């Protein structure tokens, strides 16, 4: 979890809370996606919205599939191997873009690249294909960079 930002670490805490609220006995890709969409002003959320995807629409489609469990375990809810894979893919996606940090945008790209999980299935069906979201990530950051250079020009 070394290079995780405050916001990228809060998405994993909210994943544990989302699993607990639904009384699930596991943290899957679904809970990392439900964690992510709390951060409405981050690059991940802004990337999806700029592709005409709505956050509460993502929530409804994830929740319809995964349902509700019997009872959350009393201790830590265990991450699934694919949930672990999403987090590993997120930290390999950051360097490839030339980023010195793991942000909400890398977790979104991790969820999509994982490919097999509920998160990837929901996002792909809403038109959140990997290369399309990557391009949107890059354009948003380049777009933010230009606005802040205008600011900087006092």
Residue numbers in the entry: 2 to 155
Article, verbatim:
ClpC1 is an ATP-dependent homohexamer that is responsible for substrate recognition and unfolding. ClpC1 is a 95 kDa caseinolytic AAA+ protein with an N-terminal domain (NTD) and two nucleotide-binding domains (D1 and D2). The essential ClpC1–ClpP1–ClpP2 proteasome complex of Mtb has recently become the focus of several drug-discovery campaigns. The NTD (amino acids 1–145) has been studied extensively to determine the most critical residues for the binding of ClpC1 to several natural cyclopeptides with potent anti-TB activity.
Since single mutations at sites Leu92 and Leu96 of ClpC1 caused a reduced binding affinity for ECU, the crystal structure of an engineered double mutant was solved to investigate the mechanism of resistance. Since the L92S mutation had a lower affinity for ClpC1-NTD, it was chosen for the double mutant. Superposition of the structures of ClpC1-NTD-L92S/L96P and the ECU complex resulted in an overall r.m.s.d. of 1.12 Å or of 0.71 Å without the three N-terminal residues. The N-terminus of ClpC1-NTD-L92S/L96P is a curved loop in approximately the same orientation as in the RUF-I complex and apo forms. Looking into the changes at the mutation sites, a distortion (‘kink’) in the helical backbone induced by proline and the missing nitrogen bond acceptor of the carboxyl of Ser92 was observed. This C=O bond protrudes out of the helix axis and is at an approximate hydrogen-bonding distance from NH2 of Arg4. Accordingly, the L96P mutation apparently does not have a significant effect on the length of helix 6 as both the ClpC1-NTD-L92S/L96P and ECU complex structures terminate this helix at residue 97, while some other structures terminate at position 98. This subtle alteration is significant in relation to the binding of ECU, as the conformation of Arg4 may be important for the three previous residues of the N-terminus (Met1-Phe2-Glu3) to adopt the extended ‘ECU-binding’ conformation for site 1. However, in ClpC1 the L96P mutant confers ECU resistance, as do the L92S and L92F mutations. As shown in Fig. 3(b), it was observed that the double mutation L92S/L96P introduced a kink in helix 6 and replaces a hydrophobic residue (Leu) with a more polar Ser.
